[PDB]
Amino acid sequence: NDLNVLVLEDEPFQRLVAVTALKKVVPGSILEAADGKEAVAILESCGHVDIAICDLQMSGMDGLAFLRHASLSGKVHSVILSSEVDPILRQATISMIECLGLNFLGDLGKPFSLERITALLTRYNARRLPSVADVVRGLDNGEFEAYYQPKVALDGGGLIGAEVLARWNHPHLGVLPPSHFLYVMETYNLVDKLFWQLFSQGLATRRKLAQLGQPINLAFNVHPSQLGSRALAENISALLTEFHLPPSSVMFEITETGLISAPASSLENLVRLWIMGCGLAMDDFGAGYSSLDRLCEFPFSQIKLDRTFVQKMKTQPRSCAVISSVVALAQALGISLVVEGVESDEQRVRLIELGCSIAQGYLFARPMPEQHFLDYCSGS
Amino acid sequence: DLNVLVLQRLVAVTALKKVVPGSILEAADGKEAVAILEDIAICDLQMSGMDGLAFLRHASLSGKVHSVILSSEVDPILRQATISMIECLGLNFLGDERITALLTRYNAREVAELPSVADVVRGLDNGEFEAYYQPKVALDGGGLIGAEVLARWNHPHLGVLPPSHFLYVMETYNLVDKLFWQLFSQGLATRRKLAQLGQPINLAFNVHPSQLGSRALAENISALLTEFHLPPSSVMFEITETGLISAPASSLENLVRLWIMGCGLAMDDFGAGYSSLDRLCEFPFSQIKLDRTFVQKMKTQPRSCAVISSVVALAQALGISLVVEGVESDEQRVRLIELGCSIAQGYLFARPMPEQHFLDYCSGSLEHHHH
Amino acid sequence: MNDLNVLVLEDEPFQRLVAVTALKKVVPGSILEAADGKEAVAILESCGHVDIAICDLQMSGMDGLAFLRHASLSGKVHSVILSSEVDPILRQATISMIECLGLNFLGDLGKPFSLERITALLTRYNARRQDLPRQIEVAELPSVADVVRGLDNGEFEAYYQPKVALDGGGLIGAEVLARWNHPHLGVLPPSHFLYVMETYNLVDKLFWQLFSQGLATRRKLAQLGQPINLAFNVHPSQLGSRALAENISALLTEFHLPPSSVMFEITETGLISAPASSLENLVRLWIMGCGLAMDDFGAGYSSLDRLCEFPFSQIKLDRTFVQKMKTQPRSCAVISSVVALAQALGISLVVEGVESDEQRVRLIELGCSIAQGYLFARPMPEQHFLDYCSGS
Amino acid sequence: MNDLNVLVLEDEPFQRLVAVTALKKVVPGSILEAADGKEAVAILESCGHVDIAICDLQMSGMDGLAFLRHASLSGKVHSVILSSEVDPILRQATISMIECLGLNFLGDLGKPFSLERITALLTRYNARRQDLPRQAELPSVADVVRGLDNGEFEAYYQPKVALDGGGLIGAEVLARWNHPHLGVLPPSHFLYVMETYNLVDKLFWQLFSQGLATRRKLAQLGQPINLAFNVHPSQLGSRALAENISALLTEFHLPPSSVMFEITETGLISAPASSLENLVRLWIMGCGLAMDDFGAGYSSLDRLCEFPFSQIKLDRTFVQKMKTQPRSCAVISSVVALAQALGISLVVEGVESDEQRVRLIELGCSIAQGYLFARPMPEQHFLDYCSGS
Numbered sequence A: 001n002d003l004n005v006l007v008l009e010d011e012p013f014q015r016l017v018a019v020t021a022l023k024k025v026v027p028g029s030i031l032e033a034a035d036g037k038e039a040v041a042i043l044e045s046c047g048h049v050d051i052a053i054c055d056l057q058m059s060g061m062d063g064l065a066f067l068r069h070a071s072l073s074g075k076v077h078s079v080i081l082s083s084e085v086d087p088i089l090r091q092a093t094i095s096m097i098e099c100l101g102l103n104f105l106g107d108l109g110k111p112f113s114l115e116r117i118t119a120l121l122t123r124y125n126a127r128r129l130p131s132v133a134d135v136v137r138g139l140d141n142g143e144f145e146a147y148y149q150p151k152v153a154l155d156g157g158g159l160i161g162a163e164v165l166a167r168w169n170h171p172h173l174g175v176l177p178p179s180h181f182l183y184v185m186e187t188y189n190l191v192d193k194l195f196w197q198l199f200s201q202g203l204a205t206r207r208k209l210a211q212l213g214q215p216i217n218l219a220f221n222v223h224p225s226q227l228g229s230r231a232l233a234e235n236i237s238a239l240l241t242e243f244h245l246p247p248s249s250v251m252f253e254i255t256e257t258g259l260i261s262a263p264a265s266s267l268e269n270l271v272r273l274w275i276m277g278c279g280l281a282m283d284d285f286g287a288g289y290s291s292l293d294r295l296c297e298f299p300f301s302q303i304k305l306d307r308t309f310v311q312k313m314k315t316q317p318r319s320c321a322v323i324s325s326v327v328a329l330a331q332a333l334g335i336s337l338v339v340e341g342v343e344s345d346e347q348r349v350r351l352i353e354l355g356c357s358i359a360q361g362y363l364f365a366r367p368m369p370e371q372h373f374l375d376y377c378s379g380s
Numbered sequence B: 001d002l003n004v005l006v007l008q009r010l011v012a013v014t015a016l017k018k019v020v021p022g023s024i025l026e027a028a029d030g031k032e033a034v035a036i037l038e039d040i041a042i043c044d045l046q047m048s049g050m051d052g053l054a055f056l057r058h059a060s061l062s063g064k065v066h067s068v069i070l071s072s073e074v075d076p077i078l079r080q081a082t083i084s085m086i087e088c089l090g091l092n093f094l095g096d097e098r099i100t101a102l103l104t105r106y107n108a109r110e111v112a113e114l115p116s117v118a119d120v121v122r123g124l125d126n127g128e129f130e131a132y133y134q135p136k137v138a139l140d141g142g143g144l145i146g147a148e149v150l151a152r153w154n155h156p157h158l159g160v161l162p163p164s165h166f167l168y169v170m171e172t173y174n175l176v177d178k179l180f181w182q183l184f185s186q187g188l189a190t191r192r193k194l195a196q197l198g199q200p201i202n203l204a205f206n207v208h209p210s211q212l213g214s215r216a217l218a219e220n221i222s223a224l225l226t227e228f229h230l231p232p233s234s235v236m237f238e239i240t241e242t243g244l245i246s247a248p249a250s251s252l253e254n255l256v257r258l259w260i261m262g263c264g265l266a267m268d269d270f271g272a273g274y275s276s277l278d279r280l281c282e283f284p285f286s287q288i289k290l291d292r293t294f295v296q297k298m299k300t301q302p303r304s305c306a307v308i309s310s311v312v313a314l315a316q317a318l319g320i321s322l323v324v325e326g327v328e329s330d331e332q333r334v335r336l337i338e339l340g341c342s343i344a345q346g347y348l349f350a351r352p353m354p355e356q357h358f359l360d361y362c363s364g365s366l367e368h369h370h371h
Numbered sequence C: 001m002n003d004l005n006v007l008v009l010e011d012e013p014f015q016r017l018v019a020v021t022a023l024k025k026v027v028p029g030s031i032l033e034a035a036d037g038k039e040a041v042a043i044l045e046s047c048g049h050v051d052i053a054i055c056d057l058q059m060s061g062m063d064g065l066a067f068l069r070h071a072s073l074s075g076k077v078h079s080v081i082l083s084s085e086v087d088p089i090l091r092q093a094t095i096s097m098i099e100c101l102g103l104n105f106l107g108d109l110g111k112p113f114s115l116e117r118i119t120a121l122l123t124r125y126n127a128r129r130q131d132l133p134r135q136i137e138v139a140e141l142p143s144v145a146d147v148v149r150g151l152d153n154g155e156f157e158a159y160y161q162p163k164v165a166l167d168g169g170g171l172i173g174a175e176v177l178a179r180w181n182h183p184h185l186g187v188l189p190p191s192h193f194l195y196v197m198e199t200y201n202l203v204d205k206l207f208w209q210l211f212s213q214g215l216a217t218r219r220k221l222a223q224l225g226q227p228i229n230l231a232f233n234v235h236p237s238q239l240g241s242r243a244l245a246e247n248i249s250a251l252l253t254e255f256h257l258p259p260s261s262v263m264f265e266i267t268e269t270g271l272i273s274a275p276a277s278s279l280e281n282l283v284r285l286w287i288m289g290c291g292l293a294m295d296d297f298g299a300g301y302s303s304l305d306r307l308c309e310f311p312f313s314q315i316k317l318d319r320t321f322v323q324k325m326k327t328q329p330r331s332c333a334v335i336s337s338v339v340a341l342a343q344a345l346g347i348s349l350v351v352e353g354v355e356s357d358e359q360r361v362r363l364i365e366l367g368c369s370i371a372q373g374y375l376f377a378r379p380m381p382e383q384h385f386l387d388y389c390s391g392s
Numbered sequence D: 001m002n003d004l005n006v007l008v009l010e011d012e013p014f015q016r017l018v019a020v021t022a023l024k025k026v027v028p029g030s031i032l033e034a035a036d037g038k039e040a041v042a043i044l045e046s047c048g049h050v051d052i053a054i055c056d057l058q059m060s061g062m063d064g065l066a067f068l069r070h071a072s073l074s075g076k077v078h079s080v081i082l083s084s085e086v087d088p089i090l091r092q093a094t095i096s097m098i099e100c101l102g103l104n105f106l107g108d109l110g111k112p113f114s115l116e117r118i119t120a121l122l123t124r125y126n127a128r129r130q131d132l133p134r135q136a137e138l139p140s141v142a143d144v145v146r147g148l149d150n151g152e153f154e155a156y157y158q159p160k161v162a163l164d165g166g167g168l169i170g171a172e173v174l175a176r177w178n179h180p181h182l183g184v185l186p187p188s189h190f191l192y193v194m195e196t197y198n199l200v201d202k203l204f205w206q207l208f209s210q211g212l213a214t215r216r217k218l219a220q221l222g223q224p225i226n227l228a229f230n231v232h233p234s235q236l237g238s239r240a241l242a243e244n245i246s247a248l249l250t251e252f253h254l255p256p257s258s259v260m261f262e263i264t265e266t267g268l269i270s271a272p273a274s275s276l277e278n279l280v281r282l283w284i285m286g287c288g289l290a291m292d293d294f295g296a297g298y299s300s301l302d303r304l305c306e307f308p309f310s311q312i313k314l315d316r317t318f319v320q321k322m323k324t325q326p327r328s329c330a331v332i333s334s335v336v337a338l339a340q341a342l343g344i345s346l347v348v349e350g351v352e353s354d355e356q357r358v359r360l361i362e363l364g365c366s367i368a369q370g371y372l373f374a375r376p377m378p379e380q381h382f383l384d385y386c387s388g389s
């Protein structure tokens, strides 16, 4: 009311029947393409397209490449498939449409039953938690921004470094945390993609900080799956070069858990980064069995313990004992320890009493976007 | 007749001008060693070492060094990783006078060893891996229905090698993807010739399970098919039943795109789980294949025959093809025909061949059929 | 949000520890732990509700799925998370199978078990909590103790289900099936006791009670000139005892019965999961001359190869195969392959769960020959069964 | 390339089936399956040689590392393949730890087994078949059963001492076989088997009453040295343990406080809650409790609402690693810090040279065991040792 449908249908009689069925039910314009090249030109100059329709059973490798064109244009919202999808590959097909960053509206067979074209229109406008399609589009569209949380010294004011955190400017929900997209990115293998957007932003921020005479070390989280990648280390350097920042300006964090399930060849990237001089933190330390055995076998330059140690100090003396033990450990290996989630002064002094040097939490600073951080940094 | 580059820099070099008979070059950094071109590179790898990590890197794709002694005895804790890191560049790793001990080791370096990681990375980089082709044939008559594309290494000293001598390496070092694209385009080229000889014959490529998780496998396959002006159905992709079991969660995206494109999809080593019949049901493979042990155990085991029968019925009821592997003799060829099998691979027809042998096999076979 | 309730089923103490440690950090509420069926059913019995069960679908020490089935009958469980992110092709089928139990599928946990991922699944749960069916403590799921006393008070009766030819309904044999004459709940099928008996090693006790009620009946049939063989289910655990085959033979002799008058049935999963030492009893029953049937068949072929000679005279197709015929027609191809298999081995095929005549005709069309199900005859107590066995 | 014997250890029957199915297609030889230890050991005894053991170090109903240790001593096993690619950082330690047993490590299998990866490991095996071995009389199951049924096991005692001085604090009670033919044997030659055939408990009640006889002597003498007895996880099962321990202490006129129980970290981790209730019961009774073999990490601390341990003991390997693995010194430091902050004692084991006695002092360690001070002794020697002090 009024919609804008684009049908891709090669076979001319089929085209004829389809479009004619669409006139009856579809309030609004309708466009027509006899192949990929003609459809990609209807795109090359048109506004929004509410629904794209094409036939994946009949063709085939054209239909797929089209949908990508549909995807790349940024101009299409939803998809109806003009053949019935096989029950056994239903979810496969939907998921495939959604990794294009298109919404799957539905499917139906030629010649179209008119009641079925209504069902899907009603359903469509009825769409007026984020979906897979949403995440992919958000990512293909530079909506993801880097946030910054400082690692400060507990005693004094301090400013030692920062953890780069992923946030998403949602056009309707606003700023969101990883739990609302990492699932999707994790499941569909977009983590790498997000990583490189953020790593670039992060280095740009690192430059502005070097321009300002600030030794703020920027720490990035690396997903274990990336650790298996052939050229991660070689790509991190190429960018560190392109940006004229030195290795040591920068640090990569990997959880203890994720390090457990990491791919056979993870070490090839890890020796790289270590030699290079990049700092390497083992994050959420104390999560597996052999935590102490791990530090032994890999020269991590930092250890981080998480929100729960701090919270548990007061009510649970065993936490204090392990905080102290860890302090000793970092102390004896000559590396840094960051204690996360400090929210109160009580907590802060206790940590000092125990021996901890670095912290993060809402006491000092919540995660911040580039500018608020830069301002924060101009001040210590 | 012996080359040394190295990169206190004077202690080892007078200790070298006392040892190595030949041409001794030298440089202070990457840039100056990269110019020092116009056999052995000794290396300090607590250079820490991005400069310590520019050097070896041109060196490797330059084809300008073969072997690497480090100028430092690194911390045993990441000695393995560091060795993997060298070798992964395609450079051989000798070690850390113990000095002269390894310089005559490899100036000399007979039942000889399995290839090193470095060996395999090199061969991969220097076009030494070649597609071979084994025909799928109509048991009744003499094919020719298709061909499987296999990987062999034209190793410079050892001759032709089967995957046992390189695939572990590539799997552990995430190099299988790189081999696949090499052999895939080789196979597409052969498929052109095959059309050009009037023999449209489907070619099947084995896909490694890890590859199915890769973001744009199917689309690349798609682009490449367009480049070679070949239709999707001239090509097939085979994945082992167990491989599919261990496959990444994203795998179905690639499989559905291939199916939708119209390439064939074969489930290879059918029956190796655990859920075999259930799995066939949930995905529409156009072909399943039996391991060669099924045909071998046909004399001893009435059971082997039974499962062949069962699978023959399974494929005919799904309207898909069945390939039986391991056909080594004529008596097992006729037994297979009683059982209702139709397509086969095996030594009786042809072991895997390099392109030209395969083409000549094809010509001959066509000529035989026409009489 | 509140006292979330999470039960983790994990066999392997180091995975359990990793998982539990991660859950403690992030889950608001209690984390419960089970290493085996016994802990798991105990935890279930004492709990009022279990909001999320985290389950590993292949364990050595526990059948995860069987616990889920039992759990679904309890009323107490909202949702399931799987800790094996396995098998892409079979993933939908695995989901639906969970969903047909009553259960809600939340997602899979990775074998990392990343804290971020965990909170996603919790937010996800928490957004569904209301829309989910109420948790009630169903009193119809007899407790372990309660099962244990029934089994000590002679209230388990043998029922008999005929196996018949598909064209006609001519009698061929029958399976003996366990029913519980529950003092106050009525007559219960295996859904209501078998899983408990399996988990507390009480199956062997049930088998000896039913096996002799059955031989009694087989004796009466012989006397009637009715050559109907009776088939008894042997659970894999029972194969544990080196003397099973010898105990079975002493008992057959005691009842004046030849081995050929009887058959034993083991599931495919059971046969697969048994140590070779244990598989030696089947070889023995086979040599004695008993029939042997491999039960709930249909999954693949690798069970054919466990033993030097295939000891089985019969194969039975899993009940679900008839239901899937319309629902998923590719399953007709498996029925065909299994028909072809049985014929090639020269053994018989039974197809179970035949309820309508439209199924009967299709099964005949596929080449099936012997069948069990509601369409022909319900499980009967002895006298109804005996009377049924007068009509040819 | 033929007549191999391959042993597959696999807990989980579908995984075992897949592996065995793959193995039969490709191995020229025999494929032997073991679903547990009871089966692994039996296959071991009948076998005479096993070319390759395929083994999962992370199983539920079988300890894969234990079995490999036992196989290593039998000298019947050449190579190992691991059925998991687990843990890239800890991989080199794992390989070394295996090679230190005297087994050649071949590689990992992807734990749904590929055919071409099997024949690869096969070609690797063949290449390495004639390599130089390494390192010894292993008694059989039958032998252990009769040995045990015939009172051949004796209690030995190892003092726990102050690292400076040599002051006596306590003693661990140890097991030794007084074997009719091959002499005095340590647990390396019997415990694994007892562990896997449900015989440990029987060994325990013998040595416990032997140890009680010795404590009671010490107590009549007014020499209060607590004796620590190792408890195996399986025994935590029987809910009667503590009643039975309490009843013996009574029979011997001793209080709970005179005695201590030791349990390994991995033992503690492997245990159902139903079992840890038993540990608590001993602690409520007033027995001492130690966690043996400590130092992997911190996860053990959080299994019970109350930590029931008064003592923590590091493994021999730590003293040993001090040189060839300097980083481990940090962990000792760390454990010292832990133990101290917890207000419990820390025992370091396997101290040989006074050189390494000095470093432990630096690091902060106080209590110890090892050959520097006193080697395990039979009753009477130990009774005299104590008399000195």
Ligand SMILES: [Mg+2]
Residues within 6 Å of the ligand: A163, A221, A253, A283
């Ligand atoms: Mg982090």
Ligand SMILES: [Mg+2]
Residues within 6 Å of the ligand: B148, B206, B238, B268
């Ligand atoms: Mg193949």
Ligand SMILES: [Mg+2]
Residues within 6 Å of the ligand: C175, C233, C265, C295
């Ligand atoms: Mg049955």
Ligand SMILES: [Mg+2]
Residues within 6 Å of the ligand: D172, D230, D262, D292
């Ligand atoms: Mg001890």
